[PDB]
Amino acid sequence: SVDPNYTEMEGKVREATNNEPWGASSTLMDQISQGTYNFREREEILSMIFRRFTEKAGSEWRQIYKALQLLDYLIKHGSERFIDDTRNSINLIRILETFHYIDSQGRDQGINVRTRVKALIELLSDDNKIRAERKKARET
Amino acid sequence: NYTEMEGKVREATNNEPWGASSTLMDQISQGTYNFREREEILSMIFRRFTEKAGSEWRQIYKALQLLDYLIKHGSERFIDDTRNSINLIRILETFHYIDSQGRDQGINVRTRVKALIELLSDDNKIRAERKKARET
Amino acid sequence: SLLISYESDFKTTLEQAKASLAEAPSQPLSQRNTTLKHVEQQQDELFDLLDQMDVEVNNSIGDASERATYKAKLREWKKTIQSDIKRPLQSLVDS
Incomplete structure (x- = not known):
């Protein structure tokens, strides 16, 4: 019964997507983005996210x-x-279009997932839009 | 004998240099991602x-x-x-200090605290500050 | 001229990206990621500069024989970006 043996990059993604309410830091996200420039780290980043x-x-x-x-x-x-x-995995994202959850006070929380999704x-289907957003990202 | 990380926190609080490097502070920030360093940073700051x-x-x-x-x-x-230790920070609301020339320096602490x-006790503000740090 | 300034920026950028590409494989992974990410940005900068130069060539150069000469150069530069920047970068990011 082995350990799951999360790599450093896998641990970064688990951290960036934990249940705390404050959001991943700018620098953590930046660090993960760097991982996408090599095969192994990028495969690990994709799997943890989609898990x-x-x-x-x-x-x-x-x-x-x-x-x-x-x-x-x-x-x-x-x-x-x-x-x-x-x-290539848009399908796995699209399934979240009908994500639903109402909390212990009546508030609709699922709507956050849905509009995000x-x-x-929309972004992914529009090469020109991605192109423009990457430009923006660099300037800022 | 202070640990390396504890040393960094002491350094970031020194009179000299008066401005802390965002470089030193980034090294301290990275330290908050593991139990060993995080506890050290936490305890140094609260001491x-x-x-x-x-x-x-x-x-x-x-x-x-x-x-x-x-x-x-x-x-x-x-x-x-x-x-979780917000009570220890609130104690500083009453920090009082008037210097050799009758000037109130205690207020610099009170205002900052x-x-x-205000930030720490509000989830929405924390989320917004964390995002804004990314929008830089 | 503006054109000359664009071309100077282009050549400078092209040289830098090629140098970073040659150096990348011998850097540790942590550094190599940063290097490839910068090369990817430079790749985008180079294509944008071709668009910009093409617009400027059209507006500023009236000589029809000369405008042809510039066009061929831009076309060759486009091919150089594809073969000397984009393709080796993609290959490095892929393995």
Whole structure:
């Protein structure tokens, strides 16, 4: 029964998508984006992100929300290869379009995932838009 | 005998240089991602709040600056740890100090600590500061 | 001229990206990521500069024989970006 043996990069993504309510830091996200420029780290980053989409639900919604934030950041700051890998898996993102959760006070939290998902899919389908967003990212 | 990380926190609170390097502070921020260093940073910063007083207001003031920086750039686990000890920061609301020339330097601490508590005690503001640090 | 300034920027940028590409494989992974990410940005800068130069060549040069000469150069530069920057960069990012 081995240990899951998370790599440093895998640990970075778990951290960037944990259940805390404050969001991954700028520098953590930047560090993950650098990982997308080599095969191994990028494969690990993609798998950890997409694991959250399938392994988490309900009251752990913020982890999905954060995974979507990470993904968006990587479209704007990561390798072109990473963006193509993400497109090939649009299906796994699209399934979240109907993510639903109502919290212990009546508030709709699933709507955060859904609008996030909707904007992410729009971005990915539009090469010109991605192009412009990567420009913006560099200036800033 | 202080650990390396503890040394870095002491350094970031020194009178000289008066401006801390964002480079040193980044090294301290990276330290918040593992239990060993995080506890060291946390405890050094809070010892500063306990042990220093009066004419040592500069170290308290710069400690508060570091804390602010770490909330914005460091690990979410560090934020959780800081908030758990928010009572220890609130004690500084009453920090009083008038210097040799009758000038109120205690106010620099009180004003700084009031802003940090405002930030620390509000999830929306923390989220917005963390994002804004990325929008730089 | 503006054109000359664009071309100077282009050649400077092209040389830098090639140098970074040659150096990348011998750098540790941590540094290599940063290097490739910068080369990818430079690749985009080089294509944008071709667009910019083409616009400027069109507006500023009236000589039809000369404009042809510039066009061929731009076309050759486009091919150089593809073969000497984009392709080796993609290959490095892929393995």
